[PDB]
C-alpha cells in the first residue's frame, strides 16, 4: 500500500498515470522506495530534501 501510494503521488497522482509507465519504470520506483525504507533515519536526507539549485521537479510539478 505504501509503495503504491508513493508511485501514484510521485508520478501523476492517479493510478492510470502510473499504469502509463512501463514495468521497468515501476520496478525502478519501487526499488527506490525500498532504498528510502532502508535508509530511514540513518542516511542522507537529499533523498527527500531538494538541495537549492536542483533542476529536478518540485512539489508543485503536477499542480
Amino acid at each position: 500500500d505504501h509503495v503504491e501510494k508513493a508511485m501514484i503521488m510521485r508520478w501523476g497522482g492517479t493510478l492510470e498515470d502510473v499504469r502509463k509507465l512501463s514495468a521497468k519504470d515501476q520496478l525502478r520506483v519501487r526499488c527506490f522506495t525500498d532504498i528510502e525504507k532502508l535508509y530511514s533515519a540513518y542516511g542522507p536526507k537529499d533523498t527527500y530534501l531538494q538541495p537549492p539549485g536542483d533542476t529536478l521537479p518540485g512539489k508543485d510539478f503536477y499542480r
Partner: protein, 77 residues
C-alpha cells in the same frame, strides 16, 4: 518494541550499505561495529524475553495483592 525497531533499522542500514568495507582497508572498523551490533542484538532479545515474563508476573501480583489486602485468616482449634 520501539527500541528493537530502531536498532534493527540501524543494523540493516550499516549491514547493507557498509559491508563493502570488508574488502577495503578500513575493514577492521566495520568488523568491530558488526560485532558490537551482534552483541547488542543478543542483549536486547534476552532483555525483552526476561522483561515480558517479569511484567506478567507483576501484573498478576498486583491483583493478588489487592485480594490479599482484604483477606482474613482464621486459626484452627
Amino acid at each position: 518494541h520501539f527500541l528493537l525497531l530502531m536498532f534493527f533499522d540501524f543494523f540493516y542500514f550499516i549491514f547493507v550499505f557498509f559491508f563493502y568495507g570488508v574488502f577495503c582497508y578500513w575493514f577492521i572498523l566495520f568488523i568491530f561495529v558488526f560485532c558490537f551490533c551482534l552483541l547488542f542484538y543478543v542483549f536486547l532479545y534476552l532483555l525483552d524475553l526476561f522483561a515480558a515474563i517479569l511484567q506478567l508476573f507483576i501484573f498478576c501480583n498486583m491483583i493478588l495483592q489487592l485480594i490479599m489486602d482484604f483477606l482474613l485468616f482464621l486459626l484452627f482449634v
